[PDB]
Amino acid sequence: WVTPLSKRQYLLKFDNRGVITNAVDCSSSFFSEIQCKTKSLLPNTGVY
Amino acid sequence: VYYNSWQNLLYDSNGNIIGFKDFVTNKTYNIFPCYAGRVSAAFHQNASSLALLYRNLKCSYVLNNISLTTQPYFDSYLGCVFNADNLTDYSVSSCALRMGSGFCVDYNSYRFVTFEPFNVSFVNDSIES
Amino acid sequence: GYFPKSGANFRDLSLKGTTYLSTLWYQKPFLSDFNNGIFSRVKNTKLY
Amino acid sequence: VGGLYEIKIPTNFTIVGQEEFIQTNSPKVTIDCSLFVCSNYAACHDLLSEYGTFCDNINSILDEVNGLLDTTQLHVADTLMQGVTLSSNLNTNLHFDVDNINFKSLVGCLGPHCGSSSRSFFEDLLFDKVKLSDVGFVEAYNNCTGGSEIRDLLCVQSFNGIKVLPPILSESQISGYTTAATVAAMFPPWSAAAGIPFSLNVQYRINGLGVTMDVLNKNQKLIATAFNNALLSIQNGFSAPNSALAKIQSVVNSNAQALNSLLQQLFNKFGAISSSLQEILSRLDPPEAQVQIDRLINGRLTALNAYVSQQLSDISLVKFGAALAMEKVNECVKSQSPRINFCGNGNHILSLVQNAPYGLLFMHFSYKPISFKTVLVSPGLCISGDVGIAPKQGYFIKHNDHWMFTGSSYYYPEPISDKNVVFMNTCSVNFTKAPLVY
Amino acid sequence: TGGSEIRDLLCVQSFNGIKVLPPILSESQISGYTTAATVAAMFPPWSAAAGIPFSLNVQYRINGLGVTMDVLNKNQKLIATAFNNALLSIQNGFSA
Amino acid sequence: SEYGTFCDNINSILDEVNGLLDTTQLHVADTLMQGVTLSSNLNTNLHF
Amino acid sequence: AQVQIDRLINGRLTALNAYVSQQLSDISLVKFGAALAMEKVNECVKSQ
Numbered sequence: 028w029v030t031p032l033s034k035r036q037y038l039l040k041f042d043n044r045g046v047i048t049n050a051v052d053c054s055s056s057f058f059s060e061i062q063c064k065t066k067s068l069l070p071n072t073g074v075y
Numbered sequence: 076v077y078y079n080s081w082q083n084l085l086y087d088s089n090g091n092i093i094g095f096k097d098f099v100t101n102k103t104y105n106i107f108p109c110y111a112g113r114v115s116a117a118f119h120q121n122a123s124s125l126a127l128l129y130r131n132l133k134c135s136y137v138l139n140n141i142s143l144t145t146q147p148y149f150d151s152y153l154g155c156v157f158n159a160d161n162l163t164d165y166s167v168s169s170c171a172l173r174m175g176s177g178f179c180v181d182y183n184s185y186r187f188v189t190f191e192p193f194n195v196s197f198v199n200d201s202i203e204s
Numbered sequence: 205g206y207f208p209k210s211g212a213n214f215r216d217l218s219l220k221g222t223t224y225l226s227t228l229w230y231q232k233p234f235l236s237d238f239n240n241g242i243f244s245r246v247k248n249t250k251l252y
Numbered sequence: 253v254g255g256l257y258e259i260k261i262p263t264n265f266t267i268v269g270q271e272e273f274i275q276t277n278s279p280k281v282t283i284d285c286s287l288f289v290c291s292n293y294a295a296c297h298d299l300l301s302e303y304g305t306f307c308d309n310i311n312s313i314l315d316e317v318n319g320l321l322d323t324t325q326l327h328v329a330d331t332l333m334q335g336v337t338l339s340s341n342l343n344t345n346l347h348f349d350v351d352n353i354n355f356k357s358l359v360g361c362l363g364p365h366c367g368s369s370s371r372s373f374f375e376d377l378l379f380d381k382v383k384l385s386d387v388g389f390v391e392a393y394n395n396c397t398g399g400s401e402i403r404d405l406l407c408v409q410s411f412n413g414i415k416v417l418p419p420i421l422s423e424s425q426i427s428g429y430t431t432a433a434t435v436a437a438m439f440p441p442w443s444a445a446a447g448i449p450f451s452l453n454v455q456y457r458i459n460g461l462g463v464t465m466d467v468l469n470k471n472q473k474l475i476a477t478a479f480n481n482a483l484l485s486i487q488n489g490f491s492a493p494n495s496a497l498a499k500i501q502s503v504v505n506s507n508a509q510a511l512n513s514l515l516q517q518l519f520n521k522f523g524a525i526s527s528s529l530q531e532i533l534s535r536l537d538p539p540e541a542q543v544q545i546d547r548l549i550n551g552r553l554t555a556l557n558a559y560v561s562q563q564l565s566d567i568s569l570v571k572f573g574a575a576l577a578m579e580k581v582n583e584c585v586k587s588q589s590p591r592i593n594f595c596g597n598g599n600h601i602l603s604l605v606q607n608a609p610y611g612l613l614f615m616h617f618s619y620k621p622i623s624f625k626t627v628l629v630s631p632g633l634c635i636s637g638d639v640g641i642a643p644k645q646g647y648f649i650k651h652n653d654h655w656m657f658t659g660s661s662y663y664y665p666e667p668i669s670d671k672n673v674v675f676m677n678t679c680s681v682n683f684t685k686a687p688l689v690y
Numbered sequence: 691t692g693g694s695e696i697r698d699l700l701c702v703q704s705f706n707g708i709k710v711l712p713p714i715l716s717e718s719q720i721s722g723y724t725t726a727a728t729v730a731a732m733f734p735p736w737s738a739a740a741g742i743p744f745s746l747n748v749q750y751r752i753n754g755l756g757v758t759m760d761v762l763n764k765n766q767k768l769i770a771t772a773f774n775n776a777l778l779s780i781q782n783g784f785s786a
Numbered sequence: 787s788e789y790g791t792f793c794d795n796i797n798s799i800l801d802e803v804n805g806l807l808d809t810t811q812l813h814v815a816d817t818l819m820q821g822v823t824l825s826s827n828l829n830t831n832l833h834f
Numbered sequence: 835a836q837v838q839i840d841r842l843i844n845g846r847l848t849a850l851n852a853y854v855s856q857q858l859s860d861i862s863l864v865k866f867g868a869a870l871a872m873e874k875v876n877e878c879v880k881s882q
């Protein structure tokens with residue numbers, strides 16, 4: 028399986044042992060934008 | 076335990092270095108900032124010196140790691156106090172040099188005393204019917 | 205960094221033959237533009 | 253129908269308690285502008301000195317703001333202590349309940365022989381749910397030189413010149429003042445309770461709502477038990493997602509958020525090659541390092557001016573809140589002003605005050621109807637020689653085919669008399685005709 | 691987005707990221723609440739008018755100023771007419 | 787983006803301000819409705 | 835273009851901070867006005 032790379036901004040989450048457990052492509056979707064704005068994988072309940 | 080074979084530097088979320096692994100010895104260290112802080116100096120126009128408060132520092136730390144001085148000192152609730160007599164048993168109803176938490180510097184030398192601006196009026200009458 | 209676009213597609217570019225080679229296997233869309241780069245997900249085919 | 257209207261009058265009641273936190277104070281933030289803008293770097297302190305007074309202006313505004321907070325805290329404590337007279341025989345270790353009403357949880361240690369233990373059980377229960385009170389900040393900063401592996405943001409803020417100072421009066425002193433103001437209603441001379449016993453003051457306040465005294469002075473045990481049950485319900489209510497406790501935590505959270513945003517301003521580049529003075533001064537010599545450092549100085553000084561302008565705006569709201577809290581201490585706790593919804597909602601009986609992190613917590617007690625009777629009432633009668641009468645805090649009712657009075661807040665038919673009547677030399681139109689009365 | 695030739699400044703502000711949002715309660719809801727608070731004085735149980743008919747509340751309030759009850763309950767029609775004339779004077783005074 | 791938190795601060799202060807307005811409008815409406823009891827027989831098309 | 839755009843960014847961010855500081859000041863007066871209006875509803879309309 029092959030997909031193109033490009034220069035993009037990601038949110039990255041590192042666990043307590045330094046493994047990347049999750050990531051978010053900030054411009055990929057509206058929910059991805061809320062996640063990057065709040066720097067969290069599960070944003071608080073609210074209107075953004 | 077987190078340093079893999081290609082990794083030697085530990086970073087925080089802001090991009091400060093907060094730890095490292097030494098390339099020669101493989102020993103691992105956390106890095107902490109050196110202490111930085113102010114001195115709260117109380118001054119009275121009728122005095123020739125300052126009363127100094129090192130907020131939240133114990134006097135052993137001030138003397139060992141910041142500076143030695145000839146002035147008398149004690150550990151108050153607010154931190155190490157220099158050049159003032161520990162008199163928190165004494166109390167004053169007005170205070171020009173308010174330090175916090177009901178403590179005041181008073182000047183005759185300086186005294187470190189409690190600030191109690193308000194009293195209850197007392198009567199010796201019976202509570203009971 | 206150089207990251208995939210989330211919600212874009214991978215393409216499965218692997219080809220398995222037995223004897224004959226198709227001349228179409230050596231043209232677009234198989235021959236592909238590299239641009240900045242590629243991300244690959246590769247199955248390790250564990251035979252016995 | 254005829255001269256009468258259908259009204260629901262209460263046939264039974266209880267006392268309900270409602271909490272109200274009012275903010276009267278805020279964390280005294282102090283900034284060292286020189287340490288915040290330039291850290292330890294001499295090449296930056298040089299350039300910052302060519303900006304002249306900007307750090308002096310930042311320090312002067314924050315010293316004015318913190319002086320306004322200190323003056324406000326003194327004026328609140330003065331308001332609590334105003335007029336309070338206590339017996340020197342009073343000993344809260346033995347004297348804690350009267351007339352079947354229990355105040356043990358609202359009263360701390362009284363007098364200096366017990367030390368800083370003057371916080372009440374109610375105030376203890378409220379303070380234990382808030383980490384960053386005044387003593388909470390003093391302990392957090394005491395731990396910054398403890399060598400702990402825990403990287404507290406309060407330590408990082410303080411080492412960057414952002415620190416919260418303690419208030420001029422400790423919360424233990426304020427808790428002593430709220431304790432003294434509370435016991436001033438409990439025992440003679442009753443200096444906070446209009447000079448009468450607390451239970452009689454409660455009874456007269458309920459009677460003032462339109463409840464006959466005859467039910468009150470026979471139900472006195474039921475009223476006292478309703479009162480202390482309401483107080484227990486207020487205490488238990490802090491274990492739930494309480495709106496007052498939420499408001500108190502929001503004061504700490506909004507402060508911690510503002511300080512955290514001000515610390516994060518140190519890591520912005522503001523179009524310079526780096527946000528670190530260490531990196532600039534290890535990459536460039538003075539002629540170009542000056543150009544980069546000057547961008548950081550403008551960014552950081554702009555962030556301080558923005559934070560100062562927000563702080564001035566917020567402390568205007570803290571002064572407004574403290575002025576309201578002093579007005580409630582005067583007109584709900586120390587006395588009962590004739591203002592309807594001022595001391596909380598509904599039929600307000602009486603109010604009490606306790607200390608709280610950065611404010612005061614008021615308990616408002618209200619007369620709450622439990623059940624109702626629909627009855628036919630007359631707002632007035634025309635009697636004898638067309639003399640008019642109107643009911644005081646009540647209604648005229650037909651009972652047993654006879655005209656009788658009842659209070660408006662509790663159904664209890666009692667005979668019509670000059671004690672419960674307003675006279676008029678002429679009766680109005682649509683007053684019910686009753687020639688047989690008086 | 692109506693395609694009009696009119697260049698409204700509010701549209702230019704919104705396209706430059708400056709926009710006024712509606713309040714969480716509509717002014718229609720608030721006008722419902724002020725209507726409810728007004729009729730609460732008209733009819734039993736008179737919950738906003740101290741638990742008595744509005745005209746009696748008006749009469750007692752005037753009496754409290756130092757006016758004898760005799761002239762008030764004799765002139766009730768004149769008082770009601772003065773009251774609704776004052777209300778009309780406010781409404782008409784919005785046209786000035 | 788090299789000015790970092792500046793736009794985040796502007797948005798955060800305006801969201802606080804607008805939340806103060808919303809909370810104030812609720813407290814005013816609560817004050818209007820407090821204690822109001824009406825008859826279900828009431829119909830303003832006939833009683834005015 | 836960077837040197838010019840950075841002057842526009844500083845001008846426009848300075849204008850937003852000024853407008854924000856004015857808006858905070860105005861909303862303090864709106865809260866004061868609303869507190870007075872609630873006091874008049876309670877002490878003039880619902881009671882005397």
Ligand SMILES: CC(=O)N[C@H]1[C@H]([C@H](O)[C@H](O)COC(C)=O)O[C@@](O[C@H](CO)[C@@H](O)[C@@H]2O[C@@](O)(C(=O)O)C[C@H](O)[C@H]2NC(C)=O)(C(=O)O)C[C@@H]1O
Binds near residue numbers: 219222223224225
């Ligand atoms: C790229 C692609 O399309 N890949 C497929 C492949 C080709 O389409 C085919 O090679 C093209 O051929 C041209 C270009 O002419 O077909 C495969 O499947 C075959 C049937 O389609 C397979 O079963 C074979 O069947 C036989 O009848 C025969 O000779 O094709 C006997 C042979 O022994 C047997 N191969 C074995 C044993 O692996 C394969 O493998 O080759 C599966 C692959 O995924």
Ligand SMILES: *[C@@H]1O[C@H](CO)[C@@H](O[C@@H]2O[C@H](CO)[C@@H](O[C@@H]3O[C@H](CO)[C@@H](O)[C@H](O)[C@@H]3O)[C@H](O)[C@H]2NC(C)=O)[C@H](O)[C@H]1NC(C)=O
Binds near residue numbers: 349451472
């Ligand atoms: C009227 O005067 C009497 C006598 O002075 C008062 O009675 C006393 O009231 C207290 C409650 O405030 C009683 O305390 C109770 O004691 C028992 C244990 O005996 C305990 O289980 C209860 O929880 C409570 O603490 C006290 O016993 C009682 N004393 C007497 C001699 O009756 C009364 O309070 C005064 N006021 C009124 C309105 O009646």
Ligand SMILES: *[C@@H]1O[C@H](CO)[C@@H](O[C@@H]2O[C@H](CO)[C@@H](O)[C@H](O)[C@H]2NC(C)=O)[C@H](O)[C@H]1NC(C)=O
Binds near residue numbers: 080099101
């Ligand atoms: C420090 O750690 C490195 C990395 O593990 C050690 O270097 C490796 O040592 C092993 C065992 O001798 C070799 O097989 C590897 O080839 C070495 N190199 C690398 C890159 O892995 C090194 O010996 C350690 N030194 C000390 C003093 O502890």
Ligand SMILES: *[C@@H]1O[C@H](CO)[C@@H](O[C@@H]2O[C@H](CO)[C@@H](O)[C@H](O)[C@H]2NC(C)=O)[C@H](O)[C@H]1NC(C)=O
Binds near residue numbers: 149150151161162163
């Ligand atoms: C500062 O002075 C106060 C007042 O004299 C000291 O507090 C007393 O300390 C003794 C010994 O621990 C106790 O028995 C008293 O009960 C304390 N009194 C109070 C009011 O707390 C205090 O210990 C002195 N501190 C220093 C460092 O000198």
Ligand SMILES: *[C@@H]1O[C@H](CO)[C@@H](O)[C@H](O)[C@H]1NC(C)=O
Binds near residue numbers: 168192193194
């Ligand atoms: C308060 O009480 C103490 C102890 O009796 C006394 O020393 C002090 O002078 C009093 N101050 C005032 C203002 O009453």
Ligand SMILES: *[C@@H]1O[C@H](CO)[C@@H](O)[C@H](O)[C@H]1NC(C)=O
Binds near residue numbers: 199
């Ligand atoms: C109360 O104080 C006065 C004045 O010192 C004294 O005359 C009186 O005897 C005292 N009474 C008691 C019970 O202490």
Ligand SMILES: *[C@@H]1O[C@H](CO)[C@@H](O)[C@H](O)[C@H]1NC(C)=O
Binds near residue numbers: 265
């Ligand atoms: C009033 O209500 C309480 C609680 O429901 C009940 O215990 C009491 O008996 C009631 N009294 C009357 C007179 O209804």
Ligand SMILES: *[C@@H]1O[C@H](CO)[C@@H](O)[C@H](O)[C@H]1NC(C)=O
Binds near residue numbers: 388391392395398
């Ligand atoms: C301060 O440090 C001591 C010792 O590590 C610890 O017991 C205490 O809970 C700490 N308090 C705070 C507020 O960090």
